[PDB]
Structure formats: C-alpha cells, structure tokens
Design an enzyme around this catalytic site. Structure first.
Site, PDB file in Angstrom:
ATOM      1  N   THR A   1      43.119  17.151  84.410  1.00 50.83           N
ATOM      2  CA  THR A   1      42.460  15.901  84.303  1.00 50.83           C
ATOM      3  C   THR A   1      41.899  15.357  82.816  1.00 50.83           C
ATOM      4  OG1 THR A   1      40.593  17.089  85.166  1.00 50.83           O
ATOM      5  CG2 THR A   1      41.206  15.360  86.705  1.00 50.83           C
TER       6      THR A   1
ATOM      7  N   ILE B   1      37.538  21.223  82.347  1.00 51.60           N
ATOM      8  CA  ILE B   1      38.568  22.372  82.903  1.00 51.60           C
ATOM      9  C   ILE B   1      37.669  23.693  82.938  1.00 51.60           C
ATOM     10  CG2 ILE B   1      40.561  23.565  81.951  1.00 51.60           C
ATOM     11  CD1 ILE B   1      40.793  20.464  82.734  1.00 51.60           C
ATOM     12  N   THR B   2      37.477  23.985  84.226  1.00 49.95           N
ATOM     13  CA  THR B   2      37.217  25.307  84.336  1.00 49.95           C
ATOM     14  C   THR B   2      37.647  26.712  83.976  1.00 49.95           C
ATOM     15  OG1 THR B   2      36.052  24.539  86.547  1.00 49.95           O
ATOM     16  CG2 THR B   2      36.288  26.874  86.515  1.00 49.95           C
TER      17      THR B   2
ATOM     18  N   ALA C   1      44.714  25.605  95.935  1.00 52.73           N
ATOM     19  CA  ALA C   1      43.066  25.816  95.729  1.00 52.73           C
ATOM     20  C   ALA C   1      42.245  25.185  96.897  1.00 52.73           C
ATOM     21  CB  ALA C   1      42.912  24.951  94.493  1.00 52.73           C
TER      22      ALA C   1
ATOM     23  N   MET D   1      14.591  21.577 106.060  1.00 57.51           N
ATOM     24  CA  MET D   1      13.647  22.449 106.708  1.00 57.51           C
ATOM     25  C   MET D   1      12.685  23.305 106.013  1.00 57.51           C
ATOM     26  SD  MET D   1      16.536  24.037 109.483  1.00 57.51           S
ATOM     27  CE  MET D   1      15.614  25.412 109.975  1.00 57.51           C
TER      28      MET D   1
ATOM     29  N   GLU E   1      36.986  15.938  94.143  1.00 61.55           N
ATOM     30  CA  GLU E   1      37.987  15.230  94.358  1.00 61.55           C
ATOM     31  C   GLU E   1      38.055  13.808  94.429  1.00 61.55           C
ATOM     32  OE1 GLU E   1      39.981  17.823  97.083  1.00 61.55           O
ATOM     33  OE2 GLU E   1      41.486  18.039  95.702  1.00 61.55           O
TER      34      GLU E   1
HETATM   35  C1  QQQ Z   1      39.005  25.052  91.383  1.00 66.78           C
HETATM   36  C2  QQQ Z   1      37.946  24.051  91.070  1.00 66.78           C
HETATM   37  C3  QQQ Z   1      38.542  23.431  89.664  1.00 66.78           C
HETATM   38  N1  QQQ Z   1      38.051  22.952  92.080  1.00 66.78           N
HETATM   39  C4  QQQ Z   1      36.936  22.523  92.908  1.00 66.78           C
HETATM   40  S1  QQQ Z   1      35.450  22.854  92.590  1.00 66.78           S
HETATM   41  O1  QQQ Z   1      35.070  22.575  91.351  1.00 66.78           O
HETATM   42  O2  QQQ Z   1      35.376  24.419  92.951  1.00 66.78           O
HETATM   43  O3  QQQ Z   1      34.698  22.046  93.654  1.00 66.78           O
HETATM   44  N2  QQQ Z   1      37.465  21.431  93.484  1.00 66.78           N
HETATM   45  C5  QQQ Z   1      38.551  21.470  93.686  1.00 66.78           C
HETATM   46  C6  QQQ Z   1      39.570  20.749  94.499  1.00 66.78           C
HETATM   47  C7  QQQ Z   1      41.093  20.782  94.025  1.00 66.78           C
HETATM   48  C8  QQQ Z   1      41.319  21.558  92.798  1.00 66.78           C
HETATM   49  C9  QQQ Z   1      40.499  22.125  92.080  1.00 66.78           C
HETATM   50  C10 QQQ Z   1      39.088  22.560  92.672  1.00 66.78           C
END
Ligand code: QQQ
Ligand code: QQQ
Ligand code: QQQ
Ligand code: QQQ
Lengths: 383, 380, 372, 380
Positions: D137, D160-161, D242, D337, D361
C-alpha cells in the site's frame, strides 16, 4: 427553493435571531477555544478548568437562570443550542457544562433561599466558582446522611463518579434527613475547604476523558442551617436537575453525531478507490442518507421539546424520548462513521465514539428511558 | 407539571391550525365510518367500491390543495397530509386511490393545463364524479403521440396503473417529436382500453390495470400545453410522495396502537405482557419513530406552504415514513401470537400493504441515492 | 479450484451416498407433487390427505423409525435433508410431516408397548393412518381412572392434522399426579376434532382442535414407558431438529428467487445485480444459509453418534428460523411472489413456540446456571 | 448420555486431528503464558517487543504451512487457523505480526521465489531470527528500473506492519519489459536508500509496530527479484492467505469478548439478583454463542477444503467477512453490556482493534461485492 444538505429542514430559519446569536457565539467559542485543546486533552485525560470562566464570560453558563441572579436570561432552546455546539467538539466538555448549568445552578435557583440564590448564582454564572453534584453512591435508598446538630447539620458519606468534584468550589450534595415522621432526601450546599470534605480524582476512564471526575467524601462535615435547600424534599430535588441535564444532553448528542457525519462525508469525498471517489458507492450513499435523516429528525424533536418547555406545556416523559433517541442515534451514527474510515485527523470520530459509548451507558445498561416510556404507555412498571 | 400524552407526546394536535384540525377530523370520521367497515372484505376478495371517490369528493378530500376557483377545497399541504394519514390508518390501498386522484391527476391538470382543461376536469375530479388515472410506467418511453388532423394519435402501453379499469380521465405521458408530453384522454375514446389486473399480494383494496392505446385520437385542446420533459411526470410523483410520507405514518400508528392494546390484554406467567422489559423497548421505539416522523412531515408541509421546500426533502420524509412504518408493522407482527385469530392480525393487512408500498418505487433504494447525490454531488 | 455460489462449502461432498439419495428423493417428490399444489392449497386453505400416502410410499414418514415397524431406518442427517426439501416448497407441508414423524411416530416407538408399536407404526409409516399430537391447550386436560381404562376431559388447540387424523397422541394428567401419554382413535365417543380456518400463515396445512368430553381410553392405550415432562419434550426436541433444517430450505428458496429476480431485472440502465446494496443483501443470505447448514449437519452427525446434548437443538432451531425469517424479509424487500408465502409461513413458524425467545433462555441458563 | 459444553457446543475439539489439537494447545500455552501478561501495558504505551518473533518461531508458530524442507513446521491449514485464533484471543495486534510473517512474507517467497531465495530466507523467518514485512500500500507509483547488477527501486509504502523492525522486506513494484507489470522484490535491512520510520499514535492495533518503507534509488540485485509471478496474482495470493487466518483470529477475539461478558454478568449482582438473571442479557449471550459456534464450523470446513485443494478464493471472502463482522458486533454488544467507565474492559481493547481490522480492507464492503459478482456474474 434550494436544498441545504447540512440543514434540510432549515432549523436555522426556525430559530429566533436571539437564539441564533447564542448559537453563533457558542460555536465561535467552542471552535475557537475548545477544538484546539480537545485532541490531547482527551488522549491524556488532562485536567482543565479553563472552560468555566471562558464560558462564564460570554454568558453560556446556567443560560436559563434570570438576569436578576446573574444568569443570561436565555430560553430552553438556546440552552439546547449551546450544548450542541460544545459537544460538537467533545462530550466531556459538554458534561462539565451540564453539571454547572443543570445540576448546580438549577437546584439553587429552583429550591434555594433568596440569600443562597443571591450568593452562589453570580459566581457560578461567571465561572468563578465551579460546581459539582452529589447524588450517585457506590451501592430513594441512599446512604449519605445528615444528622442535625447545634447550628445546622452534620453530613457523612461518599458520592462516586461525580464530574467536576476535584476542582469544585460549590458542592450540591443530596443526603437523607430524619425530620419527624419519616426520612426524606434533602439538598445541601457545601463549600470547598470545609473540614471532612475530600474530593480525590478518578483516573483511567475509557471515555469522557476530557472531563475531570471524582469522589465526594464526607466525614462529619458541618453545614450551617443557612446552607440547606429550604424549598424541596424528596425525589423532586435531584430529579429536576437530571431532567434539565438530560434535555441539554438530548441537544448535545446531536452535535457529536453531526461532527461524525460531516467527517464521514468529507472523507468519502476526498478519498478515491478502484476508479471513483468513495462517495460514488451506493453503500456509502445509503449510510450518509441514514445519518442525515436521523440527525434532521432528531433536531426537530429537540427543537419542539424546547418550544414546549418555554411554553410550560412539556411533561417530563418527553425528555426521555429525546434523550434516548439523540444518544442512541448518535452512537449508531458514530459507529457507522467509524466503519467508513480507513487509516488508524479524521479520528476525531474514534474519540466521539468512545465518548458516546459512555454517554449511552451513564444512566445504566437497562434502557431506563424505554422503561419510563413503556410505563407511560401502559401504566405498568417492568420488573 | 404539564400532562403527558403518550399518543401525541409533542402535541401535534396543537401545532395545527383549526381548519387543518377540522379537515383531519372530517377525514377521520369518513375513513372510520365508511372505509373501516369495508376493508376486511374488500382486501380479502380484492374488491374496490368506486363509490369511495364520490364519497371522499362529497366531503372535499380529493385534490385538497386545488383552489376553490376550480372547484377544489382550497386547503394547504398540511391538510393534504392529514387526510392521507387518516385514510391510510385504515388501509394503504384506499390512500393509493386518493393519491392518484389528487397528486397524479388533479395536480398536473392544475399546474400544466390550459384554462379550458382546468375548468372542465378539476371540478368533476374534485367531487369524484370523474375518476382519474396516471399513465407513466411501461413494461426510455415507447408510447408515442403523432400529429394528425385536429390533434394526436397515441399508440403504446402502460402497466400497473392504479384506478385505470374504472377511470373516466387518463393523464398519459408520451413522446411527441422529441419531448415527453402529457395528454388528457377520456374513457370511451376509440383506441383506448384499460384491462384490469387481479391477484395482488398487497394493496388488494385498490384496483389496478393497464392502459392500452392503439391509435387513440386526442384532440388538440387535450394536450397539456405548459410542460415538456421529465418535469411533468416528476412534479406529480413528488406530490404523491409527500402524501404517502404522511400516510405511511397513519398505518404505523395503527400497528402501534394494535400492538400496545394487545400486550395490554395478554398475559404470560400471570404477568401481563407489558411487564416485559423487551416489550417496553419495542413500544418506546414505535412511539419515538412515529413522533419524530410526524414532526418531519409537518415541517415539510409548512415549508411547502411557504414555498421554501426543495424536492430532496421529500425523499427524506417519504423514505423515512415508509421505512419506519414497515419496521413498526414487522415489530407489531412478531409481537403477536397465534395464527390469524382476532383483528390484532389487522397488522397482517397493514404489513403486506407496506411491503408493496416500500418496493413500489423499485428495489433500488432510490431515495437514499437521491440524498447521497445531494450530499456529495455524485451520481451513484 | 471451482466456486459453487449455491453451495460454497460443498455440503454435497460432506454427505454420504445414502444421504444424498434421500435428499434428492425428497426433492423429486416435493418439486413434482407438492410444488404444483401449493399455490391453490395455500390460497383456499384446502385439505389434501393424499399427501400422507404419497410420502409414506417413498418412505419419508418417520425416517428414523426402524424397518421392523415400517420406517426406512434412516439416520438423523437424512431426516433433516428431507425436512429441508419439503419446506423448500412450503412450511405447511413440512409441518404435517413433522407431526407424523416426530410428534406421533417417535413417541409410540420410544415410550409405547410392543402391542402399541406394532398396531400403529406400520400404518403411520405408510401414511395410511394419519397422526396428530395434542399437547397445547387454550395443563388442565386430564384422565380419570375408570373401569377398563381412563376417561379424558379437556381441550387441545392449534393441533396440526387433527381434523384428518386417525391416531391421536394426547397428553393429560393422571394421579397414582403426573403427565402421561394417551393414544386415541378416530370414532371414539366424546372425541371431536373441529377444523380451525382463517389462518394467516401455514394455510396449506390443516389445523384443528381436539375436544375430549369423557372420551374413553382403554388401559392398553396409555404409554407405559414415560411420565412427566420427558414425554412431550422428547417429541418437541425431535420436531425442532427437523425444523432447524426445514427453515433453511425456505430460506434457500427465497434467496434463489430473489437472486434470479435481480438477474432478470433492468432498472435505470443496468441489471439490478449491478447494485451494491442488492449484492450485499445477496452476500448476507448466502453467508447465513451456508453457515446454518454446517450447524444443522454437525448437529445431525452428533445425534447419530449420541454425543448431542439437547441444548444444541435450541441453538440450531433458533438460528435457522430467525435467519430464515430475516432472509425471507430481505428477499421480499428486493421484489418489485412465492416469497410472500414463505414469508407469512415463517412469521408463524417463528412465533409458534411463543414470543419470549424460549431457546435464548434455555441457552442463557445453560451458560450461567441461572434461570431468567 | 450426552452432556452440553456451553463453551464448545458442537465439540470443535472432537473434530480436530491429534496433530491439530496439539498445535492449538501449544499456541494457547504460549499466548496465555507469554502474550497475556504483556498485552495491557503494550497496548497502552505502544510497546515494541521484537522478541516475540523468536519466541513464536521457536515453537513453530511462524509460517505454519511452510514445509519442513525450509524450516517450517509443515502443518496443515486448519492448524494455521487454530494458531491465529489463540494469538488473537489475546490481541489482534499480535495476530497481525504473525499474519505478516506467515502469509505476507513466507508464502510469497515459498510460492513464487527461486530455490536460492527459499533456502536463504525461509529458515530464518521460520525461527523468527529474521522479521519480515510486506510493502504493497502507498500514501502504484513504486517503480523498479533495470540497471546493471539488478534493479533500482524508488517509491514509498505506508502502514506497513513490522517495517521498523524488519530484516526482510518483500516490496511490490511495477516493472516494464516485453508489458508494464507488478513484480515482487526482496530487500534486506541496511540496504542503502531503504529506510523504515515508525508510525506512532495509533487508535487500534497499538500492540503491533507499524511504519513506512521509503526507497530512494534502492539497489536490488538480479537474484532478489521473485521470478515466478507477475501482476495481481502476486499480492493477491498473499492477501488471500492472510484473510484465511484472520477469519480464524477474529473469532478468537469474539470468544474473549464473549467469555468476559459472561463472567461479568455472573460476577455482578443487581437488584439482589445476578445480572445473568436478566432476559436481555441471556439473549445477548445466546447470540454471541450461536454466531461464534457457526463461524467456527465455517472456518473449520474452509480449512479442510484448503488442505484438500477444493476451496475457491471466494469462500475466503465469505468467512473473513463473517468472522470480522460478527466479531465487531460481539465486541460492541459486550462493550455495551459493561456498565462503568474505566479489566473486563479488556473488551475496549478488542473493540478498538476490531474496528481497525474491519476497515483495513477498505471503507466499503469489498468482499460483499466479490460474492455479489460471483453469484450474478455482474461487476460493481
Ligand atoms: C496482516 C495485516 C497487515 N492485515 C490485517 S489487520 O491489520 O490484522 O487487520 N487485515 C488484513 C487484510 C489483508 C491482508 C493483511 C491484513
Ligand atoms: C452531565 C453528566 C454527569 N451526565 C451524563 S454524561 O456523563 O454527559 O454522559 N449523562 C447524564 C445523565 C443525567 C445527568 C447527568 C449526566
Ligand atoms: C399512488 C400509488 C400509485 N403510489 C405508491 S403506492 O402504490 O401507494 O405504494 N407509491 C408511489 C410512489 C410515487 C407515486 C405513486 C405511488
Ligand atoms: C410441527 C409444528 C406443530 N411445529 C412448528 S411449526 O408450526 O411448523 O412452526 N414449530 C414447532 C416447534 C415444536 C414442535 C412442533 C412445531
């Protein structure tokens, strides 16, 4: 006729210019002064007592309190308009504001002596003295008690989750008095510095972080006869205050909903995806139409409620309708808007959202306004 | 304090002028007196008594905004709304018959007609002596007018036309080369046919059919002279929508009143149903949405009377009223036990009716999209 | 590799050959013999007991009852697949079948004497005898011990099959005070079964009452091997299991009709299938339907193993009926009309066991040990 | 005599192979033993704890489906899912770190890389000695230009994780030749012209470190371009993998929220009565249980199909969308709750995480439209 998407029913035109100038002043103030503090005031739960003198200066505190006692003499609609502009920025600020106006100045004005009224109201109205409201206890069936003593009374107990208490100068405590035949709820004005009176803070709140909350701790605190409220006994005292506060919250919650809506709208206009702007998607459009509808209708509801209150024609149960609706719809809209946003400045929505999660459960998780309305339709309390 | 009116919390009754309240009361007396006794059999057997037109017309409930000059009652838009509400409180099908007369037939004649057309048609439509219909829909319009000595010759078909098998007067939209023009035809025109449609799921209490035109002659004097394009049809649809916005709230109120009275009458472990926490939430929601829906349509009505109402506001209200009314009808249905016994299942009639009303303008949530465009400047 | 929109998780490939045959057999019966009748039968609320013989013939009645007594000796998964195929046409027909199989045949088999089991089951299996189940009252129905047997006074209401039934499994109280099962036969004096007419949903099934005015039951016609709540409840639980499947058949019909409708429709310029709102609704039906089926299949497999606690039926019956109602409504709101029928049927189906979410309360209790 | 398991009504436990149950147990012991004690303060102050990758790889939790030939544990897809569920049960941020290693770095290399690339990178990614990130991205501008030696890369990736702590960078850029197509490149930390500044101040997933990838004429040798994929299938293959794991993970998050709400209502008393004695609370607990149970059957079945190769991509759209959507609903239901404002508010953490997970997404329902197209053959 031209369409105003941001004001379809032309609320602006249903207001007196009188009322309209109050809104503009409230808006100028909140946008000018509160909006630039909000983000980090929320994030770090930073105590801040500025609001009171700032709002006091421009006449936004206790707006329905007459000029006679230092209030600005505005009407219910104008109180509504003010709350809406403050919560458009943050509910925490609106809350601090609700306490001062509806939970302190109102009871003193409504049930006070002339000496109490002339002494306290002017300093509350200008924000020199900050108030708080002592009803809720850690668990009417309340524990805090006032024993009669030489002079006036001796109060002992605790109150919990009390907004403003760690910075308050005037405490309006509700406690039980054993008069002669039965024990009734009575109201007491205590001043800060009184011995036996502590008000330590509560820290680590998940929502409404921009507002400061604490305990009121009373260990044999003396209150002279001149500082009991002479003109009320029982539920009517605390309930008048909560009814007024809820009316303001009914307006205020729609302010936060509008903020979420405007952000969601601007976001999907600015962003692009798979070709077009996001605003081009039908799913997005429906969401934006639902937001607009519920806000527009909610506003007619609260406007009409305020008109009825100025006329003296509004029963208390109508407040339940608008408070419940405004809060529940604002929460739905805050979520709808949250779920339209990408990218972990727009995230004023996440803040509004956590505020509204708390606002919606502040009076419990059992939908008490539903129950007030169900009983008013059927005569039967739910058990 | 002031007294709480659970059935009218915001006192709508007191935001009305006395002429508006009088119109409402007369519409209520008529519906309850004359339509309520007919509705159960009318619906079941899919019968409509065309005498309803003459009856509503007697009382001045047809074309309520048409000025007295042309034989109308000369009322305002709030009164039109109040009337649709009282009629739909009984049945949407009856409200639909009236929606056609007033908004789809009298309105275009009044807005777009010649002096001669207005003078001839409106007084008779107003009293309900002449029954009207509106021919827009066709199974991108293929119905066509062609110039011929002394007028026009129309060939084409319209489908799903309310009132068509019993209509005296037909407002038909057809291309004339190349714009959309409106034509007034009369029953008995050689070339004009109106076969009936039977077997409806909902709105069984209204009659629907087709319009079939095989070289139907229209003389020059019966073409609507003061409109061309989509504006002709759309002005009518916009008017119709406004009254349905009010009407759907009438049916909503009935469902709510039935549901409330039902839970009052019924027991469950010796506790009456209204003791139930979940039931109270449901009644509260029904009350809240009707109360707010009514403030919306009232304000729109006042704006339309002062000329300050854009057409997009109509989308907000009609969509909300029809949408919330259907949810309320479904809420009330699912509160009911049993299978048909008791007129508590009058909710079932309202429910099927509202399911048709909420899909009549198509599966595309058209009004959400109008409002979306209005917010974003983008066609989606 | 290849995606099946109509069966995303390939339920087909999770079923034995045994079971797929039974499914396709109930499908062929339902589509060939019930679909052509349903529209008029619903409209005019017309009775047609021939349906009992036609299902008996192909062995769809009491599908889990052993061959020894005339049943086809099928497994629980097969009973489900059948319910789903019958309700795919109409819930009314499924209900007639639910009664024969779970409310009549199951209790005689489970709690009846060898004499009772041999006299009644064979003819119920073939549909030659039609059965109904008298539990629900307008419990006050009771059996006075009398010479030769018992005398039953009382009244039962909303009893599916009762005006065409030959065999009545009636539940009354008797002192020794407990709940016992009784078998009555059409013709017995003091026993009538007047028809209930004017139904809003389930109009294709015939419902009536059972009126007992000192009706005689001989000693041999009490169920010996059960007393108290476990009697009626064993029956309800089996019926609810079948309905958990059945409701998903109706949902599937609604989804398929809605999908085909939007493929065939043009609005503005394009097909309706171009609309994202429509596509989201279709994605939601597919999801809920696919997940629901994995649930009822697993429950069936567990029941066949004897690993299935009764609380799991509450989970599946609640979900299938609730989701099916939701899907019928979503489908309805996409159509600008067998859907309208499925919708009114499911509105009744969903409130048949009351309006207080009894299965939610069963599951709440089971989670918490605390009664609501 | 069958007993009910409220926490596992369909006995998912009994539908696993021993293989799979042992993997679940080890993932459970690790996450509860090592992640739960860190999570509260890590979330609060956005702690970077890079040691987690070695800890995870040590036990074979990184790149579950990668074969033993390259240092992976050679587990099946169901096992990948069970692992994700147990990690996310503690926190979505930890599951995110794992998703990146496994699906977004090890899968692309294994599936599309050369023998040389696979033996060089996979073993150290499996143990967690090397930490990976996935650069798709952008704030596709990222261009690789053919030079002597290999490729020069310029561009920027955003959100970027792992990137501030990554040793191995899988970066997707556009290349022209023979036409202009998406290729995959492998870079390594310390490469000149590569920087990876960290992002801080996140609202959700605060327990995972995220940052940028800035390439200023970064040199990638010839040997570091992935040679067996071009175009959308590259990134898509990773995203799909993923999603499958997220489909299990989100349900772990839902289970925690459910378990906390249940314990909360059992622990709390109100009106001289446990909170659990209320009808509404019981309905909410029944909905949570129903949707979790059904979701688990779906992802179990999807994993089984993936292990035997019968699973089309679209089924992953269904389950991912369901799991994440229902998790959010359950999280919101539990949050609402809880009465209070400031440990059972572990729910608040899961909630904010899931709100990021459900929007990662896109601002709109990308998967609903995939399934729509798939059902109808018509694009939106
Ligand atoms: C693993 C992280 C980046 N991730 C996440 S998330 O950040 O855990 O929600 N949703 C995704 C959907 C597609 C690809 C990677 C995704
Ligand atoms: C002003 C604060 C204390 N407040 C709030 S809240 O904290 O703004 O949500 N809700 C209330 C309801 C009744 C009375 C006071 C209330
Ligand atoms: C009056 C009837 C035909 N009608 C209906 S309905 O049949 O009463 O639902 N909905 C409409 C929307 C626009 C115009 C007319 C409409
Ligand atoms: C089979 C009929 C009577 N039925 C139905 S229904 O009428 O098909 O909905 N729901 C039931 C639940 C339990 C037992 C029987 C039920």
């Amino acid at each position: 006729a031209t369409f105003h998407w941001d004001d379809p029913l032309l609320l602006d035109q249903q207001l007196a210019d009188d009322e309209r100038m109050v809104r503009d002043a409230a808006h100028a103030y909140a946008q000018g002064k509160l909006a630039p503090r909000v983000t980090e005031a929320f994030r770090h739960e930073t105590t801040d007592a500025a609001i009171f003198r700032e709002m006091g200066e421009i006449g936004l505190l206790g707006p329905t309190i007459p000029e006679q006692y230092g209030g600005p003499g505005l009407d219910y609609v104008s109180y509504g308009l003010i709350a809406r502009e403050v919560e458009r920025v943050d509910s925490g600020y609106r809350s601090m504001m609700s306490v001062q106006s509806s939970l302190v100045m109102v009871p003193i004005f409504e049930f006070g002596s002339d000496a109490q009224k002339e002494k306290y109201l002017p300093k509350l109205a200008t924000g020199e003295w900050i108030g708080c409201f002592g009803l809720t206890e850690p668990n009417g069936s309340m524990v805090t008690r006032a024993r009669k003593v030489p002079g006036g009374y001796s109060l002992s107990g605790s109150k919990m989750w009390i907004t403003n208490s760690p910075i308050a100068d005037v405490f309006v405590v509700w406690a039980k008095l054993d008069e002669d035949g039965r024990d009734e709820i009575r109201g007491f004005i205590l001043e800060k510095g009184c011995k036996g009176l502590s008000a330590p803070a509560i820290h680590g709140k998940v929502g409404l972080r921009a507002s400061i909350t604490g305990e009121i701790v009373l260990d044999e605190a003396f209150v002279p006869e001149e500082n009991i409220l002479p003109h009320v006994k029982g539920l009517r005292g605390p309930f008048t205050c909560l009814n007024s506060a809820r009316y303001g919250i009914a307006w205020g919650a729609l302010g936060a909903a509008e903020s979420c809506w405007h952000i969601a709208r601007q976001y999907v206009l600015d962003r692009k995806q798979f070709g077009r702007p996001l605003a081009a998607n039908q799913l997005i459009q429906k969401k934006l139409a639902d937001m607009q509808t519920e806000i527009t209708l909610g506003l007619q509801g609260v406007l009409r409620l305020g008109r009825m209150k100025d006329e003296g024609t509004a029963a208390v149960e109508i407040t339940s309708i608008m408070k419940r609706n405004s809060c529940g719809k604002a929460l739905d809209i805050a979520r709808l808007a949250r779920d339209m946003l990408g990218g972990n400045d727009e995230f004023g929505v996440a803040r509004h959202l956590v505020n509204l999660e708390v606002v919606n459960t502040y009076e419990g998780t059992h939908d008490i306004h539903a129950l007030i309305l169900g009983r008013a339709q059927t005569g039967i309390q739910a058990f």
